[PDB]
From Swiss-Prot:
Zn(2+) binds at residues 250, 253, 454, 471. Residues 244-471 form the PRORP domain. It comes from the Eukaryota. It comes from Arabidopsis thaliana. Its EC number is 3.1.26.5. The chain holds residues 95 to 570 of 572 of the full protein. This is Proteinaceous RNase P 1, chloroplastic/mitochondrial.
Length: 476
């Protein structure tokens, strides 16, 4: 079979790295009238990726013909799958011609194909590296039109190019996008924002007087913690690295940060999504059985990730730590409700039930309507997440909630929900176990009604490391 033979020959051509032969075989298939499929085209795009950009001579056939091959695949109406977008992007990155990368995205659109975020990268980053703001803004407008949402690296590049070209309005808009989409910024974005506020352009941008009514109304309209009406005040910024105390008060200027509400409609949308996702991955009957059980139980003030409470910072499962956490949650519940403990059935009858009084206590919690033992093969994370979301209550876990399945939950609603609901344990020698409660304010870039900015840095563990903030306040 000829298409099956080209497959075999391109699979081999190449783990070897032979681009000149992959390009010979491509040309030969077309002289034989053998139709290249999705698989052939993808292998071919990957292999052309390995060509490198010629620093001395004019461009090599591998990269150069790679764009031709991509163009043809679309013309042929062969459907791109995830490997197509990845190899297409690798090729774009290797060539490092932002104009050619942007051409690839324009032709996807012309043929009704949805570009991916990684398709836009080599174009956007290419123009930003060249200081070409006008072209970077075109790419960004194109992304926005295709409903592709930028992440921090795209926003940071747009921020830097706006700073380089002295564009105060684009800086303002990008900073609002950082607030909306990212919330807390990486070290390098933080340093960038600090440079902005100390800069000459920042010093010289702003308004001495403004419609205070219009600001107040924008604050209500936006949901809280920003107004979006432009730079306010005049003159030099005082720009300090600082911290918030436990109540959200800036140690530099004493502004108390806002606690930003979550709209209950967004929460119900998210609960539906969460249920859909869990049922796609769990045995549906297992997850449904839990849903039905939960409808018949509670009320709950807290849901505990039992495996995480037994295991975090432990050489092996610690019933002491789980039980202490149960007792502590019950103590802080205004009506002394036991928390809902989610644990694997294998744990309810294995290592945590090793000692008879522990086993009797696990059974007592179950009999109090405060424990659900998830079935063999289940991923407990769906169960404790759904319970805390559904009961609108505290979620006790030290799980980071960022890898694997948690990526499916998105990077807007879920991080906001997590901040308001997640309780983590910490331990010290002097005191024992502590429950660390949600903050009374929102850890997000905030813009005050008078134009003052507070920008939080992102950190791995804000209980381990004290989170730094930037305070930017006009000196006059
Ligand atoms: Ca109960
Ligand atoms: Ca133990
Ligand atoms: Ca109550
Ligand atoms: Ca006892
Ligand atoms: Ca888990
Ligand atoms: Zn401040």
């Amino acid at each position: 079979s000829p298409e099956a033979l080209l497959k075999q020959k391109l699979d081999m051509c190449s783990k070897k790295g032979d681009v000149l032969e992959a390009l010979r075989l491509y040309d030969e298939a077309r002289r034989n009238g053998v139709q290249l499929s999705q698989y052939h085209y993808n292998v071919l795009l990957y292999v052309c990726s390995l060509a490198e950009a010629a620093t001395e001579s004019s461009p090599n056939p591998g990269l150069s013909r790679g764009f031709d091959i991509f163009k043809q695949m679309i013309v042929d109406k062969v459907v791109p799958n995830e490997a197509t977008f990845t190899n297409g992007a690798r090729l774009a990155v290797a060539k490092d011609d932002p104009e050619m990368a942007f051409d690839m995205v324009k032709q996807m659109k012309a043929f009704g194909i949805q570009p991916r975020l990684r398709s836009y990268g080599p174009a956007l980053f290419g123009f930003c590296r060249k200081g070409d703001a006008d072209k970077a803004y075109e790419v960004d407008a194109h992304m926005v039109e295709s409903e592709v949402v930028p992440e921090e690296p795209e926003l940071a590049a747009l921020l830097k190019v706006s700073m380089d070209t002295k564009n105060a309005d684009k800086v303002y808009k990008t900073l609002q996008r950082l607030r909306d989409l990212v919330r807390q910024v990486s070290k390098s974005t933080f340093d960038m924002i600090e440079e902005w506020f100390k800069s000459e352009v920042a010093t010289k941008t702003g308004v001495k007087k403004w419609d205070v009514k219009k600001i107040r109304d924008a604050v209500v309209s936006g949901g809280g913690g920003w107004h979006g009406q432009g730079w306010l005040g005049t003159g030099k910024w005082n720009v300090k690295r600082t911290e918030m105390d436990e109540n959200g008060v800036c140690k530099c200027c004493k502004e108390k940060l806002v606690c930003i509400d979550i709209n209950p409609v967004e929460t119900e949308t998210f609960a539906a999504s969460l249920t859909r996702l869990a049922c796609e991955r769990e045995v549906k009957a297992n997850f449904n059985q839990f849903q039905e059980w939960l409808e018949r139980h509670g009320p709950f003030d807290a849901v505990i990730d039992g495996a995480n409470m037994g295991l975090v910072n432990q050489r092996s499962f610690s019933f002491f730590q789980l039980n202490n956490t149960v007792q502590r949650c019950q103590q802080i519940s205004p009506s002394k409700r036991l928390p809902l403990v989610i644990l694997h059935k294998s744990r309810v009858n294995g290592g945590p039930a090793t000692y008879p009084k522990n086993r009797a206590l696990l059974e007592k919690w179950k009999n109090a309507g405060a424990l659900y033992a998830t079935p063999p093969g289940s991923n407990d994370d769906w169960y404790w997440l759904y319970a805390a979301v559904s009961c609108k209550c505290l979620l006790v876990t030290n799980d980071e909630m960022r890898d694997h399945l948690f990526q499916l939950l998105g990077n807007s609603f879920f991080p906001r929900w997590k901040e308001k609901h997640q309780v983590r344990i910490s331990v010290t020698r002097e005191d024992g176990l502590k429950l660390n409660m949600p903050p009374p304010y929102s850890i997000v870039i905030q813009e005050s009604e008078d134009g003052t900015w507070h920008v939080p840095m992102s950190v791995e563990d804000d209980l381990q490391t004290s989170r730094q903030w930037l305070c930017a306040k006009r000196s006059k």
